[PDB]
Design an enzyme around this catalytic site. Structure first.
Site, PDB file in Angstrom:
ATOM      1  N   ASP A  47       0.876  -1.181   0.000  1.00 12.10           N
ATOM      2  CA  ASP A  47       0.000   0.000   0.000  1.00 12.10           C
ATOM      3  C   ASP A  47       0.915   1.235   0.000  1.00 12.10           C
ATOM      4  OD1 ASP A  47      -1.799   2.146   0.597  1.00 12.10           O
ATOM      5  OD2 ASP A  47      -2.439   1.243   2.496  1.00 12.10           O
TER       6      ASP A  47
ATOM      7  N   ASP B 170     -13.516   4.798   3.042  1.00  9.88           N
ATOM      8  CA  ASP B 170     -12.072   4.858   3.245  1.00  9.88           C
ATOM      9  C   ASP B 170     -11.647   6.302   3.565  1.00  9.88           C
ATOM     10  OD1 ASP B 170      -9.282   5.007   2.990  1.00  9.88           O
ATOM     11  OD2 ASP B 170      -9.228   3.443   1.393  1.00  9.88           O
TER      12      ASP B 170
HETATM   13  N1  LIG Z   1      -6.672   5.702  16.481  1.00  9.22           N
HETATM   14  C1  LIG Z   1      -6.838   6.677  15.567  1.00  9.22           C
HETATM   15  N2  LIG Z   1      -7.793   7.628  15.685  1.00  9.22           N
HETATM   16  C2  LIG Z   1      -7.977   8.611  14.775  1.00  9.22           C
HETATM   17  N3  LIG Z   1      -7.225   8.716  13.661  1.00  9.22           N
HETATM   18  C3  LIG Z   1      -6.240   7.822  13.440  1.00  9.22           C
HETATM   19  C4  LIG Z   1      -5.979   6.737  14.375  1.00  9.22           C
HETATM   20  N4  LIG Z   1      -4.937   6.013  13.872  1.00  9.22           N
HETATM   21  C5  LIG Z   1      -4.580   6.607  12.719  1.00  9.22           C
HETATM   22  N5  LIG Z   1      -5.347   7.689  12.468  1.00  9.22           N
HETATM   23  C6  LIG Z   1      -5.240   8.601  11.315  1.00  9.22           C
HETATM   24  O1  LIG Z   1      -5.275   7.933  10.067  1.00  9.22           O
HETATM   25  C7  LIG Z   1      -4.674   8.804   9.096  1.00  9.22           C
HETATM   26  C8  LIG Z   1      -3.745   7.990   8.214  1.00  9.22           C
HETATM   27  O2  LIG Z   1      -4.535   7.041   7.481  1.00  9.22           O
HETATM   28  P1  LIG Z   1      -3.876   5.752   6.773  1.00  9.22           P
HETATM   29  O3  LIG Z   1      -5.040   4.966   6.217  1.00  9.22           O
HETATM   30  O4  LIG Z   1      -2.943   5.088   7.772  1.00  9.22           O
HETATM   31  O5  LIG Z   1      -2.923   6.307   5.604  1.00  9.22           O
HETATM   32  P2  LIG Z   1      -3.235   6.786   4.075  1.00  9.22           P
HETATM   33  O6  LIG Z   1      -4.019   8.067   4.228  1.00  9.22           O
HETATM   34  O7  LIG Z   1      -1.862   7.053   3.508  1.00  9.22           O
HETATM   35  O8  LIG Z   1      -3.937   5.626   3.429  1.00  9.22           O
HETATM   36  C9  LIG Z   1      -3.948   9.892   9.878  1.00  9.22           C
HETATM   37  O9  LIG Z   1      -4.728  11.111   9.846  1.00  9.22           O
HETATM   38  C10 LIG Z   1      -3.897   9.329  11.290  1.00  9.22           C
HETATM   39  O10 LIG Z   1      -3.756  10.319  12.314  1.00  9.22           O
HETATM   40 MG   LIG Z   2      -5.201   4.745   2.099  1.00  5.27          MG
END
Ligand SMILES: Nc1ncnc2c1ncn2[C@@H]1O[C@H](COP(=O)(O)OP(=O)(O)O)[C@@H](O)[C@H]1O
Ligand SMILES: [Mg+2]
Length: 371
Positions: free
Chosen positions: A10, A175
């Protein structure tokens, strides 16, 4: 040789994740800092290149630190960094993305104990041929034969085994990542996927929720101090970004969080400090416009696909931001009666699906166990 392991990657706007099939189960591999995801951030100091957590820690303070490169993939836009001798190095989105892929490949090889030369990489469903080809090229630069490019919502559905369903299924994928919000309606029939409709906003994500906390802290400060010009203090700004994300994440598990920033900046009367209790209720009030903007894209895909809400068989929650209680409640309100799927870590689920796809492409039933 040419038939070895196919890792799943990913390559996200905010974070990246690598997984591989091992004894018929997908495993998520830890980076050298012990973390199962890696920030999609790259720093340049001539030919010394730093990827991930160490680069995120300087994203505000270092002018040669590159963030959000995914947004440029498929364009001929360049990013510039400055060499020690003052000359300018122009970088393509493919080149910067390739540094992230190389970092993942390098640590994955050390964990697995073998060289790796094959991958499945995920992309947004809306990516066109040029955007997909840019992602393949980044793989090639990193030493990976990209065996297949698959869509992020399809990868999530593979992780959950939905391709193995006995009946035709319509699946809603919600998503919410760090930078983008994607809703997809999939039709799964005969083990194949069709994207019926997509919606969302590629400038809405978890960063925006952080930024509302930063805006709130700035208000608290303004009650005691004027004329700070807080944005010019790059250390202060880096600390505010880190504190806001930390506070947000704590509020997914707890009803309050304490933001503590001693000596945040200085004025002619001494230090500016922050000690602020933020409740989940106040956080939700501050961020209500952001949350509500995720609602209409759900009904957009329902409308475009010409289905009734009752025809949605399963809902998948993808992206780190879906850990927020208010996000889960919103999704439930829009598909009455259905319990959403969040049992697979939503920050890893896309990479897990890619790893399953890799196993299937490699073959050997002892290896992928796909039934
Ligand atoms: N427990 C949580 N509560 C709220 N937000 C979260 C939590 N864990 C991760 N995030 C948020 O998820 C986001 C990242 O999403 P992710 O799906 O890991 O990456 P991408 O956007 O690259 O697909 C960030 O804004 C992060 O702060
Ligand atoms: Mg993503």
């Amino acid at each position: 040789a040419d038939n070895g392991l196919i890792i799943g990657i990913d390559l996200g706007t905010t974070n990246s994740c690598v997984s591989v099939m091992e004894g018929g189960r997908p495993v998520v591999l830890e980076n050298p800092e012990g973390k199962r995801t890696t920030p999609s951030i790259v720093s340049y100091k001539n030919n010394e290149i730093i990827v991930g957590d160490a680069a995120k820690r300087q994203m505000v303070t270092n002018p040669n630190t590159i963030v959000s490169i995914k947004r440029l993939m498929g364009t001929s836009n360049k990013v510039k960094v400055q060499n020690a001798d003052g000359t300018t190095k122009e970088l393509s989105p493919e080149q910067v993305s390739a540094q992230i892929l190389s970092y993942l490949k390098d640590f994955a090889e050390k964990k697995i104990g073998k060289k790796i030369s094959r991958a499945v990489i995920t992309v947004p469903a809306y990516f066109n041929d040029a955007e997909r080809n840019a992602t393949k090229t980044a793989g090639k630069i990193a030493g990976l034969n990209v065996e297949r490019i698959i869509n992020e919502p399809t990868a999530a559905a593979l992780a959950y085994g939905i391709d193995k369903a006995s009946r035709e299924m319509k699946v809603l994928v919600y998503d919410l990542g760090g930078g983008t919000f994607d809703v997809s309606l999939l039709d799964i029939a005969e083990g194949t996927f069709e994207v019926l409709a997509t919606a969302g906003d590629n400038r809405l994500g978890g960063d925006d929720w952080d930024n509302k906390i930063i805006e709130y802290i700035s208000a608290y400060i303004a009650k005691e101090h004027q004329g700070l010009n807080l944005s010019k203090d790059k250390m202060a700004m880096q600390r505010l970004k880190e504190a806001a994300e930390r506070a947000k994440i704590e509020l997914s598990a707890q009803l309050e969080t304490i933001i503590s920033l001693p000596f945040l900046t200085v004025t002619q009367k001494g230090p500016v400090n922050v000690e602020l209790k933020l409740t989940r209720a106040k956080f939700e009030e501050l961020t209500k416009p952001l949350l509500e903007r995720t609602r209409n894209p759900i009904s957009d895909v329902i409308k475009e696909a010409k289905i009734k809400p009752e025809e949605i068989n399963e809902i998948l929650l993808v992206g780190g931001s879906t850990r927020m209680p208010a996000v889960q409640k919103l999704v439930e309100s829009m598909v009455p009666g259905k319990k959403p799927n969040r049992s697979i870590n939503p920050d890893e689920v896309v990479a897990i699906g890619a790893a399953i796809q890799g196993g299937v492409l490699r073959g050997d039933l002892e290896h992928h166990h796909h039934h």
